[model samples]
Target: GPLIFVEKTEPVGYNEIVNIKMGDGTVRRGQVLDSSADIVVVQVFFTGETLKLPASVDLLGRILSGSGEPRDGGPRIVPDQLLDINGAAMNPYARLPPKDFIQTGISTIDGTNTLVRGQKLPIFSASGLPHNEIALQIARQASVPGSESAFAVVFAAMGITNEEAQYFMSDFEKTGALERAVVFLNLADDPAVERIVTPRMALTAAEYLAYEHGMHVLVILTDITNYAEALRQMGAARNEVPGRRGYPGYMYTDLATLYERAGIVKGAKGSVTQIPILSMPGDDITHPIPDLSGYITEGQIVVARELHRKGIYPPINVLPSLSRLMNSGIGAGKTREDHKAVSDQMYAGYAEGRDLRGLVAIVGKEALSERDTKFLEFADLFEDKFVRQGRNENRTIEDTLEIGWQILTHLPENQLGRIDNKYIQKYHPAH
Candidate 1:
């Protein structure tokens, strides 16, 4: 059975929505996947057997399905204008640097890899890790300091199981944050084409909520590799040429269409901050999915299997984790004047401790110097105390920094070279 029809002399745009009138007195939705000079190819939604017919795109507001249909028992919205799902490239000259801090209530992130508004920060995790739990926690607790009430969340879960979908819904409802969220769920059984549109649809709604309604929007996309795999599957169906790892050659360009959407537009009070969660295949960071994402996103929050095995929640590996815009978002007026200094000292202390563990194995711990001994102690305390927080516990920035200072105490005062003398004098426990 032919799934596509070449219609001549019909004005149709790429990725434009369409509806086909079936002989059973029913209509099925579809989209224009490709439009040639004289013919248009339509990929019908759900099934490919709908009678070919021309139709215009329908339009979003609250919760939407993967195809942008209202799913929260709400009426469909008719927009005054149609914005491209593949948004235009923002000119560099008109872009604004990310300068506002977004608190996720997770100490390892807020205290170390701080997420800034209008930044695309990805979370790299492995299979069987607690990425979903962390994602839900962030959704429930993330907030902007000054614009708390004006903040909204757009959570899009792609290629997830039915049970996982229920968990997300239940978690959001139980936390009472569902009212302020627009959730898009694409289950594993759903059409693969739907997965491709889930994130974009979520971002589209986020753009409308943020730019049009003047609200700060946080878009959380889980399992981005699923989305990329969906693209590869679709490409295989189209018989297109493949690139690295059998993915489409244009995968980078395709991903950019979504990642580049996050940022503050000129003259807009509201902003869109993205936290895309990616599960590395076999925990390989060099895999195509994470590698390309690393290039496009500002930085990553890496979830460590070793930490998870040690029963640490939100097992963020601080050494590998980084927030490129962290400095811009934290300072005197933003978070605290000593925020950067404290973070640097904590990082240095932890790195020293971790490195010494290897050396201690080669030579004995008893053979180590006094300074090395203190750093090793500091590392243990940092992981058990600083990196580990309760699942539901929400700590403020002050609390996180105070915990960092407490960990720094285990190291000698002279060893805290990363921190300036002024901050050391002000925040040191002995002071």
Candidate 2:
């Protein structure tokens, strides 16, 4: 027989979960990677050390290893429908353009670089940074107005340590988000082969919840670089020719399989938005992982190391971070009437303030004009008062816009060029 003998009436299909007998007189779960009438190649989720013949492949979804079975001690999930983990991409012609902002309840994100529904945005971070904190914060606070009942979060963590996994699970539980979240954890010590399936399982669950049940699903995949490393290992085992940085040449296509799953189908009532987080090796954004992701995703949210050094909470560098769908998501009915003007003014002021710092360094501060000094001061205040927020703080869009106006107060009226006179009268603190 194959890895283990199966006495079924028909051959087991591909990617189906099967139970294999272990030498310890217990059964371990595995997936059928390749199958035929006579022989089937099973990829075990755990170490295949102890394998006794004559195993059984059951079709139940109870306590399956590695597979995303319900572990909340709740009733088993009777899926409304079965979906292939490798989902089909929405047709380019039928796909709806992303619109409507997703409020993450963070001032830095909601106020600028807004997350649009059905957009694929990746977070670019470095090692030892607080990316996990930001991810957990978003998972707890993200939602759309009046559609709260239909929102769901699908979180998948790959190649993370046991401690990291526990922290994520604890935070989700503490925030009461676990009720609406489907979590898949692939620990660092777990089989590298299993990491490949973790995200697919998560996205499949997201598809069922979003397409099948009319739910707005947010799929968060953390540490995708780890998933890429696993892909490289799998390629090495196959002895295939390596491409850039020893990764397989088909890396972009593989990443697209996961990223392209995020969108609104033509007739579906719900959407799937993705926030795949990856750590750039040595803080290099040009690495193959982030490079390929940039091509597939709409835009990126880059976390600044300098902001982390300055003790900023979220450390999001708004200058480099952008949402390509920002125009479609904000203004008027989406976020607020003054959202765009406030965001533009705030960005211009902060950018000028940041630029002045360079000039101030070369020529002493005393050599600068009064306007330049105020611009520089505004930068400091922007980071402190606007970018920095409590890990648990959930700011509303109104509050974020108000904060932008308050920070602009540091600059003179002439410096606010991006904003219109009408908005200045409405939102400016001086008004």
Candidate 3:
């Protein structure tokens, strides 16, 4: 197939390009793979030994990338005279796309979550929902896409760990009277008995500035975890029986009331966007705290553990993340005509690459089909180049779109299925 050979001729290696013409009048691409002995074993592009004997071989001197990947954006080299000596073998079959659902036992998960390998499916459960069984079942039985490789899954979360306190302390230490942001700190925490009203006080102060002064305000409450625990403490002290997962039965009402404090008063010229940050006691999304909040909030930007591990300034799993107001926030006159298109294409490209990751472990990437490899390349640069940024790096929408186009330029035109051709012609790096 792909590994066709030629010998008793012009000896060649070192990333040289070869035009492999089949006797059948079809052509495929290839590069020299510095191999031993006489037969030039080129790991041909695309696939198999489909060519007949006496197939034409045109050797063109060309320097290629380390993995024989495209780079330099250089012009294709004109071919030299052909050295005729080649033989090969080949193969193909239509790979129908994945459609079988992963069984997670829970109706919501088995039907909706759709945990295909490398796909970033999220579990958004709620109070009184028993999602542990759903999690355990999935953990015990999950596939590495087409491979038999199984992944070990573990879960973690809880209210206001001591490390989180220090995390808040140093990040807030940089806070000086910027004259804008107001912060509240309560320390020497025992059971955090006084933590219950901390966010309320902050929001109340914010409401005063925003509504009373007619100024658009942003309120950041570090977490409602400690607050909830304080409420739990109060519930315990009052000798009341615990509700779901030892949280107050009325915790939803309490949190709803807290978040409700944000927004415009009926006649105010100003608005409030309340950002309540909470550490999942064990990073459990199904936990009552985060689950209930999602009901009240438009969407959550669930910070990603993988992105953090890979060393992003601030990693967010944009796959599962959403903002319902995104539709209204960006548009024709809002950001730019190309904004939505570029964003959509980026997600599409990134997702395609993401899915290929698992399969990569099973088969060497040399086996990658032409179109699929571009996606794998796109996914890597998307995270490191686009998703990565310094805390001090200030990039405007223009800069972002420009960067987006630059990264996308590497991908094939066919891969940009989500973008409009008009925008693609204008915004794309290559015409």
| CA lDDT for candidate 1 | 0.73
TM-score for each candidate, following the candidate numbering: 0.81, 0.81, 0.56
For model 3, how does the per-residue alpha-carbon lDDT over 1-431 read when each residue is reduced to its tens digit? Answer: 23344331466655577765643456767766433232344445722232112111110111111111112244532322121222111111112222222232221122112222112233333332322222323333332222222122211112344574444334333432112333344433432433443443344434444444444444444445545555544422233333535443444455555554544333334444444545456533332232444433455545566776787634555577554444443345444578778878877788889988876877879888878888999989888877665543444455667778898898878768888899988778886
Q: Write the per-residue lDDT of candidate 2 for residues 1-431, one digit (tens) a residue.
A: 22332223346666687775543445668766533233344544622322111111111212222345444455545543333343432231125797787889988788889988888888889888999889888988988875543887878888888798778767777778776777777788766556766776677666666665667778888888888766654522243333546543444466666676778745556788888887877633332332455433588898999999999989999998888888888888788999988888788888888999999999999999998999999999999999999999999888888788888888899878888899888878889
Give the lowest summed-lDDT range of ten residues in model 3.
54-63
After best superposition, candidate 1 residue 257: deviation in angstroms? 0.6
Prediction-by-prediction clash tally: 0, 0, 15
Every candidate's lDDT: 0.73, 0.70, 0.44
Instruction: Indicate whether candidate 2 or candidate 3 has the larger lDDT.
Output: 2
Cα displacement (angstroms), candidate 3, residue 306, comes to 1.5
lDDT of 3 at 169: 35
What ranking of all candidate models by lDDT puts the best one first?
1, 2, 3
lDDT of 1 by residue, 287-312 (tens): 33424554345888999999999999
